[PDB]
Paper text:
To elucidate the molecular features encoded by these conserved elements, we solved the crystal structures of [name] [name] and Zea mays B6T1C9, each representing a different clade in the phylogenetic tree. Both proteins fold into a canonical α/β hydrolase architecture and superpose with a root-mean-square deviation (RMSD) of atomic positions of 1.54 Å over 210 amino acid residues. We found that a loop constituting the hydrophobic tunnel lid is the major component determining substrate turnover rate and substrate specificity.
Similar to the crystal structure of ZmB6T1C9/ZmAPT2, we discovered a substrate tunnel in the AtSOBER1 protein, though severely impaired by a two amino acid insertion (LP63-64) into the loop that constitutes the tunnel lid. We found one insertion (L63) to directly block the entrance to the tunnel. The insertion of the second-amino acid (P64) pushes the following residue (F65) into the tunnel, which is positioned in the middle of the hydrophobic tunnel and could act as a hydrophobic anchor for the lid. The two amino acid insertion is conserved within the entire family clade, well aligning with the leucine at the tunnel entrance and the phenylalanine in the center of the tunnel, the latter of which is in most cases a phenylalanine or a leucine. In contrast to Zea mays acyl-protein thioesterase 2 and in agreement with Cunnac et al. (2007), Arabidopsis [name] displayed a clear preference for pNP acetate. We found B-factors of the loop as low as the rest of the protein in AtSOBER1, and increased B-factors in the acyl-protein thioesterases APT1 and ZmB6T1C9/ZmAPT2. This indicated that in AtSOBER1 all protein parts retained a similar rigidity, whereas in APT1 and ZmB6T1C9/ZmAPT2 the loop had a higher flexibility than the rest of the protein. As previously reported, AtSOBER1 repressed AvrBsT-elicited HR, while its paralog (which we named AtTIPSY1) did not. Subsequent incubation of acetylated AvrBsT with purified AtSOBER1 led to hydrolysis of 14C-acetyl-AvrBsT. Altogether, our experiments reveal that AtSOBER1 is a protein deacetylase.
Numbering used by the authors: 2 to 211
Write the structure that this text describes.
């Protein structure tokens, strides 16, 4: 069956820069999968004093701590673009439970928002070193089926760009929302992707495909 993996890059990065990630998923189950690595528009970014770069949504403050300010309206605009991608792939014949959304840092925050607001259950959302980009006021708007999408959250314990504490803060948020989240901490890892972290995501996607 057709598998679709949408990967969302982090702040200032691009889709093509991250496309080689797919070569790290060498299993026969995942080499069949269709990948998409979109690029965020060029936007001013508040944490960089308005400097323009590829950015999914405005980031008021980086490093991101528990309690850091967020721009909820801007995240919700970015979710619309992600949802258009997902809608198209499903309409073209892909089973929603074969759709996986992954992302790093800003892209992980967007992954979380996009999955939890999508009207259908998806295969899963993999957050790498992200943060929760809205407050608990949004939970009432999570569609019924979205709460059944599993989340795998990966975070380095030594991350000082998006504090590990901010990644841990997603867990009581997801529990309040009724969402199942596996949290995988990576000791000594900072704000980057490790191969062992990607290998675990692959195993998790394979298990979800069942």
């Amino acid at each position: 069956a057709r598998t679709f993996i949408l990967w969302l890059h982090g702040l200032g990065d691009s889709g093509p820069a991250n496309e080689p990630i797919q070569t790290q998923f060498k299993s026969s189950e995942l080499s069949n999968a269709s990948w998409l690595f979109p690029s965020a528009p060029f936007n001013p970014v508040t944490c960089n004093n308005g400097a323009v770069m590829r950015s999914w949504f405005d980031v008021p403050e980086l490093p991101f701590k528990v309690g850091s300010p967020i721009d909820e309206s801007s995240v919700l605009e970015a979710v619309k673009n992600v949802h258009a991608i997902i809608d198209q792939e499903i309409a073209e014949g892909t089973n929603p439970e074969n759709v996986f959304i992954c992302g790093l840092s800003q892209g992980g925050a967007l992954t979380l928002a996009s999955v939890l607001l999508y009207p259908k259950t998806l295969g899963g959302g993999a957050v790498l070193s992200g943060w929760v980009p809205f407050t608990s006021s949004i939970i009432s708007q999570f569609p019924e089926e979205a709460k059944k999408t599993p989340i795998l959250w990966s975070h380095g314990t030594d991350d000082r760009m998006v504090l590990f504490e901010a990644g841990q803060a997603a867990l009581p948020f997801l529990k309040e929302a009724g969402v199942t989240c596996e949290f995988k901490a990576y000791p000594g890892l900072g704000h980057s992707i490790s191969n062992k972290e990607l290998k675990y995501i692959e195993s998790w996607i394979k298990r979800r495909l069942k």
